[PDB]
Amino acid sequence: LPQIPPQQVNNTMYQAFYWDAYPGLWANLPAMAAPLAERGITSMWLPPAAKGMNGTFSVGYDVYDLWDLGEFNQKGTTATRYGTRQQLQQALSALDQLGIQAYFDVVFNHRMGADAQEHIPGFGLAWTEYHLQGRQAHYTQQNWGYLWHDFDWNWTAFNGSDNQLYPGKWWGNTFHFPYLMGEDVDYNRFEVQQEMKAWGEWIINSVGFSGFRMDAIAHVDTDFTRDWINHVQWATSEDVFFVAEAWVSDINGYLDAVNTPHLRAFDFNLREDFVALSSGSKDMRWWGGLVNSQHRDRAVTFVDNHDTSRAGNPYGMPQVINYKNQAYAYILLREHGVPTVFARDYDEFGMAPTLDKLIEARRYFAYGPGHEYSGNTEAVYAYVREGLSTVPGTGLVMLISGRNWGGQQSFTINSHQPNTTFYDYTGNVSGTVTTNAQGYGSFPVTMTESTGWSVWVPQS
Amino acid sequence: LPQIPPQQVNNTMYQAFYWDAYPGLWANLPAMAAPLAERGITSMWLPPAAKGMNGTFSVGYDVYDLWDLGEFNQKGTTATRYGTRQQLQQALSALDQLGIQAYFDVVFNHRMGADAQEHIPGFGLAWTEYHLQGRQAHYTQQNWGYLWHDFDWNWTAFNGSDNQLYPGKWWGNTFHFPYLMGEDVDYNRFEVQQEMKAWGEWIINSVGFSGFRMDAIAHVDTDFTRDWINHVQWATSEDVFFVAEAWVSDINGYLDAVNTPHLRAFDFNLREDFVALSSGSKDMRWWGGLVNSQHRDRAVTFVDNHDTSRAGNPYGMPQVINYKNQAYAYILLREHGVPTVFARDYDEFGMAPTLDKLIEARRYFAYGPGHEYSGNTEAVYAYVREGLSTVPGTGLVMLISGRNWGGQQSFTINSHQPNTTFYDYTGNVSGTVTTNAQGYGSFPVTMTESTGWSVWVPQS
Ligand SMILES: C[C@H]1O[C@H](O[C@H]2[C@H](O)[C@@H](O)[C@@H](O)O[C@@H]2CO)[C@H](O)[C@@H](O)[C@@H]1N[C@H]1C=C(CO)[C@@H](O)[C@H](O)[C@H]1O
Ligand SMILES: C[C@H]1O[C@H](O[C@H]2[C@H](O)[C@@H](O)[C@@H](O)O[C@@H]2CO)[C@H](O)[C@@H](O)[C@@H]1N[C@H]1C=C(CO)[C@@H](O)[C@H](O)[C@H]1O
């Protein structure tokens, strides 16, 4: 396999959970991640790891105490759904030896599970008194100095609940609607901003994560988001990875509003093309999405996540059932974006036998400039990676069929590698393809759903 | 002085010329560069280095042969205005030794100085026959292989001239008007595109430049522009620098049209604030500029260049007569953008003494998160750099007067450094400032033109 200079290895993200998945994940995470690292996964998005209101039953999004990573006895348990902090720290060390960066699912927008009610003057009853043992232990003046503030999480830490404002509050400068659920956190209050900057430092520099997936971040004040990202980046030696879950109509607008070069965003709109792909009738010449937009460099592409694919389909999203490998090929091999392999696809749906080779194709071959194919048809999409002049053996000519016909079809494509012989890394088409002196070869693809993708890369 | 980690040192650019300046620059450049390296200049925008139509009298923008860097006798001289290519290579070696990156001023849009005319069938005479001895010497099949194409630069390498298209030609997809001057090069021709890629690799990997100032590039086909940048970036092991001279009304839309993360652009709009500043009557609360836009991270800021500041004022631009040190402070110490120090200001106008301390202020202290100041007045702008937690002694509190009243005014500002004693690195205000437990100090600034900027930094 071609050997890539480490600093140039493509980042391939793996979402290491789906809904209700993997109770006790932390203990098992080293084993799960060992083969994934061999394939070419270089980062995993872990489920929200902080204590949530429903204890071991919580997936993590009903977050209670951001400073309690399965360490303190609260909400009925010490461990989270996934395990104790010790098991998490050992998981992080294992992933570290394996070369994998772990991203934290931070839930900034809301809190749930108050320890007691309060009477808020001029308002009434609210579930706003939060005790937060983990905060008491780690958010101390000794640890954080200038970022430490003596204040209690009660109703003055929140904008409000049930889309009603608490006295003297306002929702903030939010790109989406401000209120989603729970007790909406007031990031217009200075002491909360500073504590969150301290927590971001703790997660990277002390706990040992390498980046964040930012839950519902478009419901959160945009100025705080920018200032917290900017603070954590300046505060860390590594280049920390930030990806927004900004599930809005205009994700380009959201990124321009936050206005930090460190923030990426999930490509929600590219999925609509995979929805069309699943029909088996999509015109394979047209592709939209963030990854073909003026923010394409800041795109994090995916096929499904725990909201889009979930038993019962609770958010009513159209499903991506068919042609899923062609969808994964599209996100994995093209030059732009950081792609996400979804655990439910790899694991539960059992797509690992075919996905394994696509992760390797991205890992060891998808390098050099990218080229679109003037010869795309209504039924076949093709794409080229030149490869690396420095690394002979890189480059790829990929083809995907959006039809279930049977048989093959071939396309004359310029690989930009003269007089080079290729072969199909996927094992879907047999034989070789030899290019001519100007770089062109005749590459086939199978016109089926089940095997309708091919990734031709140069022979050893 | 604070010791900044090598990979974190701010980029500070110096445009190493102005109009008609420095005949024989190459021999004198290492001498000029050594003290500037000490102050903190890290990159130098060098004048267009390729042979021009006007020989030793060519600043370099009437470019004739891009492969002739002063190595071949054509246009009446072997050496350019700035020297031989031997003397250029020696200057680049010395810059390497000083840790200074060199940026090549590439002139892609047009050619001038045709050797003979051609009778274009169905058009008439045109000055299109380019002999190009440098191209004969270096653009060879043995040197470049796949990128080498056998063709001569005659009328079929250009789109037209005098805003008139040649037969079969179109102007291309250009953001600005396509025609500026000379023989407009056809970048919609494959062979011309492929040759320019070869040349880009040559400049970086063989001559030893580190980046590019892209002349008149809004007039050049946007798709070539993106493809060239991306090709050169992939073909270079180092992180190559690219700044566009896109002198258009909507620089944001230009950078979105080219759509590569590697391209920066000059912030022409911010200069309009410095024109206002120069009057002595600017409202210092208000600032525009690309550096304050959604493309701020891709801004290259400056006060003047060889087009805006020139004897005779050839393009009718308003001049920044006064408050020039305040302008420089503004572009040098704020967190976004890469700033440019102009040789005409440093040298001819004698600003070196004061610019020396503001360059050192950027090199050594301008790190960590930036913060705007809520208490800006019509007369005073202020701004804070929080500094680095890992490097004690960094950070700064800058203020700039836009008034010439005399005396001093003090401003209560959060420096984000508790219990810290500051002093004015510019020496314009005597004494020290001591911040309280929460980081706030009372920072003075002189209300004058000639001394009205202060840059408070931590005592050592
Ligand atoms: C579940 C999901 O809901 C919201 O997303 C909606 C978008 O706002 C809309 O644009 C709409 O078109 O569809 C989306 C689904 O209705 C919300 O904005 C998202 O942040 C949210 N996803 C995360 C939020 C959670 C915490 O409240 C979790 O429940 C969820 O699993 C997260 O992925
Ligand atoms: C000198 C300058 O001319 C053009 O610039 C104009 C802009 O296009 C307009 O938007 C307008 O506002 O004013 C500008 C000045 O008239 C052109 O676009 C620029 O590229 C050009 N600058 C470079 C071009 C040259 C030719 O190679 C050189 O003469 C000049 O020194 C370069 O800096």
Side-chain angles (χ1 to χ4, degrees):
Chain A
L1 278 304
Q3 291 312 318
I4 304 294
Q7 325 245 47
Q8 295 174 3
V9 163
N10 285 325
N11 185 2
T12 316
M13 191 164 90
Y14 187 90
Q15 163 166 15
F17 68 101
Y18 49 98
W19 195 258
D20 289 339
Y22 305 155
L25 169 68
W26 299 152
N28 292 136
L29 183 45
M32 293 173 34
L36 292 176
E38 282 176 52
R39 307 289 82 88
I41 303 297
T42 72
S43 70
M44 316 168 83
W45 155 26
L46 309 194
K51 181 66 51 53
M53 152 190 77
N54 291 324
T56 67
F57 297 87
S58 152
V59 179
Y61 292 108
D62 57 339
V63 66
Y64 168 70
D65 189 349
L66 279 173
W67 296 86
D68 174 2
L69 305 188
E71 191 174 354
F72 304 85
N73 178 29
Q74 321 183 91
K75 303 294 111 194
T77 169
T78 303
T80 68
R81 173 153 182 87
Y82 311 116
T84 67
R85 195 195 157 174
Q86 174 82 240
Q87 299 166 316
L88 173 59
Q89 304 289 165
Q90 295 163 351
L92 292 178
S93 286
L95 308 190
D96 219 311
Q97 184 73 30
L98 295 165
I100 296 162
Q101 310 183 305
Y103 302 148
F104 194 101
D105 203 330
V106 51
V107 189
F108 271 142
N109 176 69
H110 47 252
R111 295 286 179 96
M112 311 233 295
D115 295 281
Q117 270 175 114
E118 274 186 305
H119 188 276
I120 305 173
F123 187 94
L125 283 315
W127 284 92
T128 50
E129 180 174 314
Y130 280 81
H131 289 171
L132 310 172
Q133 291 187 23
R135 187 181 175 262
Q136 304 169 22
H138 302 301
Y139 186 45
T140 53
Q141 186 184 74
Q142 189 164 220
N143 279 345
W144 305 113
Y146 170 74
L147 300 178
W148 183 72
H149 287 275
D150 185 5
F151 74 95
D152 283 319
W153 276 61
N154 55 29
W155 75 265
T156 62
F158 300 98
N159 297 317
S161 60
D162 303 321
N163 204 25
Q164 313 177 122
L165 285 167
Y166 292 161
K169 297 294 192 193
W170 62 297
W171 295 110
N173 172 33
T174 58
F175 188 89
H176 207 342
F177 287 97
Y179 188 80
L180 176 70
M181 76 195 213
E183 301 295 318
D184 190 75
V185 178
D186 181 5
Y187 295 99
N188 304 111
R189 164 171 193 186
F190 177 69
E191 297 76 31
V192 174
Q193 301 165 359
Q194 302 302 81
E195 176 191 331
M196 296 302 105
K197 295 177 198 189
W199 176 92
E201 286 185 39
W202 180 61
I203 289 297
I204 305 304
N205 289 343
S206 302
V207 173
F209 285 79
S210 315
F212 304 86
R213 178 261 193 184
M214 308 178 73
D215 183 62
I217 200 52
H219 307 281
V220 174
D221 184 284
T222 298
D223 302 304
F224 164 79
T225 306
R226 168 175 60 252
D227 291 349
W228 177 86
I229 293 181
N230 200 44
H231 176 90
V232 173
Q233 192 65 283
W234 271 116
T236 56
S237 45
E238 283 154 18
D239 179 21
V240 176
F241 182 94
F242 303 94
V243 54
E245 191 231 10
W247 203 347
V248 301
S249 171
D250 182 352
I251 297 175
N252 304 77
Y254 171 73
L255 290 172
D256 288 349
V258 175
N259 202 12
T260 175
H262 316 301
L263 189 53
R264 304 158 199 261
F266 284 122
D267 197 337
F268 283 95
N269 222 73
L270 173 78
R271 187 185 181 268
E272 295 285 323
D273 285 317
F274 304 147
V275 163
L277 187 62
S278 189
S279 84
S281 282
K282 169 181 170 54
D283 195 326
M284 302 297 271
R285 292 172 300 174
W286 328 123
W287 297 89
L290 197 73
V291 77
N292 297 301
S293 80
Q294 80 268 26
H295 289 80
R296 53 154 78 128
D297 49 297
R298 277 150 286 167
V300 180
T301 50
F302 71 111
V303 177
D304 265 324
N305 59 39
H306 59 298
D307 293 337
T308 58
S309 172
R310 190 151 121 198
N313 195 16
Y315 303 112
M317 292 285 96
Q319 299 300 285
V320 172
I321 299 282
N322 308 116
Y323 297 82
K324 281 190 89 141
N325 292 281
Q326 290 91 334
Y328 272 112
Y330 186 102
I331 67 168
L332 280 166
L333 309 175
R334 293 175 77 259
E335 166 177 12
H336 306 286
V338 177
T340 313
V341 176
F342 183 39
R344 193 183 186 202
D345 289 339
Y346 192 90
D347 191 355
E348 185 181 287
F349 280 105
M351 303 188 54
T354 61
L355 288 191
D356 274 3
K357 314 184 153 141
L358 290 177
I359 299 153
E360 284 156 22
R362 156 162 198 98
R363 170 61 181 83
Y364 303 100
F365 305 100
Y367 296 95
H371 305 280
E372 305 281 341
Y373 183 42
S374 62
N376 289 330
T377 65
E378 47 105 25
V380 176
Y381 172 88
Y383 187 90
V384 170
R385 305 303 295 274
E386 278 194 28
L388 281 203
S389 34
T390 49
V391 199
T394 65
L396 62 84
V397 191
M398 67 153 274
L399 304 102
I400 58 174
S401 147
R403 296 294 182 279
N404 198 22
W405 289 347
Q408 310 178 6
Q409 304 189 132
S410 307
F411 301 78
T412 299
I413 306 147
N414 184 10
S415 72
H416 303 259
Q417 308 200 75
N419 314 318
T420 307
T421 291
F422 293 77
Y423 80 104
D424 185 5
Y425 198 78
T426 80
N428 284 319
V429 176
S430 308
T432 67
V433 175
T434 296
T435 60
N436 73 15
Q438 300 85 264
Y440 294 80
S442 190
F443 302 86
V445 60
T446 310
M447 302 300 308
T448 67
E449 192 257 8
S450 72
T451 57
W453 63 97
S454 284
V455 187
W456 305 96
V457 302
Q459 240 175 2
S460 79
Chain B
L1 289 178
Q3 291 295 314
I4 313 295
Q7 79 277 8
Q8 298 185 235
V9 176
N10 283 323
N11 193 356
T12 304
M13 186 164 87
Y14 187 86
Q15 170 177 21
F17 64 99
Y18 48 106
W19 198 256
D20 289 341
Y22 309 147
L25 181 61
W26 299 153
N28 298 331
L29 184 62
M32 298 169 31
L36 289 157
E38 276 199 330
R39 306 289 76 76
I41 296 290
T42 66
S43 60
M44 281 183 167
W45 161 19
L46 304 174
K51 177 67 46 74
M53 168 194 63
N54 279 353
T56 62
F57 299 106
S58 169
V59 174
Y61 292 105
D62 57 343
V63 71
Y64 164 87
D65 191 350
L66 280 181
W67 298 87
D68 177 9
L69 306 186
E71 188 186 4
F72 305 96
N73 178 286
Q74 25 182 27
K75 311 288 102 199
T77 178
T78 301
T80 71
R81 178 160 184 78
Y82 309 114
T84 72
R85 187 194 152 182
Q86 202 182 63
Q87 289 170 318
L88 175 53
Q89 303 290 182
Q90 279 154 333
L92 289 174
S93 282
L95 293 191
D96 287 346
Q97 277 279 78
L98 295 156
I100 279 185
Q101 298 176 337
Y103 299 153
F104 194 106
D105 197 334
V106 47
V107 183
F108 273 154
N109 178 66
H110 47 272
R111 296 286 176 108
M112 289 182 76
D115 300 294
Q117 282 166 108
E118 285 184 306
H119 191 277
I120 310 190
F123 181 85
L125 289 168
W127 285 95
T128 53
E129 182 175 272
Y130 282 79
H131 290 351
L132 303 184
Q133 272 187 75
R135 178 176 188 260
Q136 306 177 10
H138 297 300
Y139 187 53
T140 61
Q141 196 272 339
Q142 198 184 11
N143 281 343
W144 296 113
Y146 170 68
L147 295 178
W148 182 79
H149 293 263
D150 181 21
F151 71 115
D152 297 319
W153 277 68
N154 55 25
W155 75 261
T156 78
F158 305 104
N159 291 320
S161 56
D162 285 328
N163 209 18
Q164 164 62 40
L165 285 162
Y166 294 153
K169 297 298 188 174
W170 59 103
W171 287 119
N173 170 215
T174 63
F175 192 82
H176 204 349
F177 287 91
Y179 191 70
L180 178 59
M181 71 191 218
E183 299 297 312
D184 189 78
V185 178
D186 178 11
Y187 288 103
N188 314 111
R189 181 173 166 186
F190 188 63
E191 291 80 24
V192 171
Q193 297 168 3
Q194 294 301 97
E195 176 183 337
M196 290 314 113
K197 296 178 188 192
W199 178 90
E201 280 175 64
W202 185 58
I203 296 302
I204 303 293
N205 291 329
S206 289
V207 188
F209 280 90
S210 291
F212 294 89
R213 183 258 181 197
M214 300 183 76
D215 178 73
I217 199 62
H219 302 277
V220 168
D221 182 89
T222 59
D223 298 298
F224 164 70
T225 305
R226 171 184 52 250
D227 289 345
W228 183 86
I229 297 159
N230 208 44
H231 172 94
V232 166
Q233 188 68 281
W234 273 108
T236 52
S237 64
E238 45 153 60
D239 178 22
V240 177
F241 186 99
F242 302 89
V243 53
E245 187 228 22
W247 201 347
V248 297
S249 171
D250 189 0
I251 300 179
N252 305 84
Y254 169 84
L255 291 171
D256 283 343
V258 178
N259 200 12
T260 169
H262 304 300
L263 190 52
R264 313 171 189 250
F266 285 125
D267 189 353
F268 281 99
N269 189 237
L270 179 65
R271 194 184 179 273
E272 279 151 47
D273 283 305
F274 304 153
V275 164
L277 178 65
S278 168
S279 78
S281 301
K282 181 196 162 30
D283 194 316
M284 302 299 285
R285 291 174 290 173
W286 319 136
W287 298 86
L290 186 67
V291 78
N292 289 311
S293 78
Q294 71 270 24
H295 293 90
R296 47 157 80 145
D297 64 292
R298 284 147 272 173
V300 174
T301 51
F302 69 99
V303 185
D304 262 323
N305 57 38
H306 65 291
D307 286 344
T308 67
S309 168
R310 188 200 301 198
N313 201 348
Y315 299 122
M317 293 287 85
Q319 285 315 292
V320 181
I321 296 170
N322 277 128
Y323 299 93
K324 216 145 201 224
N325 290 281
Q326 286 88 332
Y328 266 119
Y330 187 97
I331 68 167
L332 278 172
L333 316 177
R334 303 173 74 258
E335 160 176 40
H336 319 283
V338 173
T340 320
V341 175
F342 186 30
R344 215 192 166 195
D345 289 323
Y346 195 80
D347 183 7
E348 183 185 333
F349 297 153
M351 299 191 60
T354 52
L355 294 185
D356 276 341
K357 297 204 202 156
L358 291 183
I359 283 154
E360 291 169 7
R362 167 167 180 83
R363 167 62 170 79
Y364 290 102
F365 306 97
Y367 296 91
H371 311 269
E372 306 291 339
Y373 181 40
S374 66
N376 291 341
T377 71
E378 55 104 29
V380 181
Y381 176 89
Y383 184 98
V384 171
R385 289 303 287 277
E386 179 183 311
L388 294 169
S389 325
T390 66
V391 188
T394 52
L396 61 84
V397 184
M398 74 165 252
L399 298 80
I400 54 171
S401 166
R403 294 302 185 269
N404 195 51
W405 304 331
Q408 316 185 348
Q409 243 163 9
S410 294
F411 291 89
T412 303
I413 308 169
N414 185 4
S415 78
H416 293 271
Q417 313 209 40
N419 303 315
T420 300
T421 309
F422 294 82
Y423 74 98
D424 183 4
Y425 200 80
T426 67
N428 284 330
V429 177
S430 293
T432 64
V433 182
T434 302
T435 57
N436 60 26
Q438 299 79 21
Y440 287 79
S442 174
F443 294 88
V445 69
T446 315
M447 308 299 297
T448 62
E449 191 281 330
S450 56
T451 63
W453 65 98
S454 277
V455 182
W456 297 96
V457 289
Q459 251 176 7
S460 48

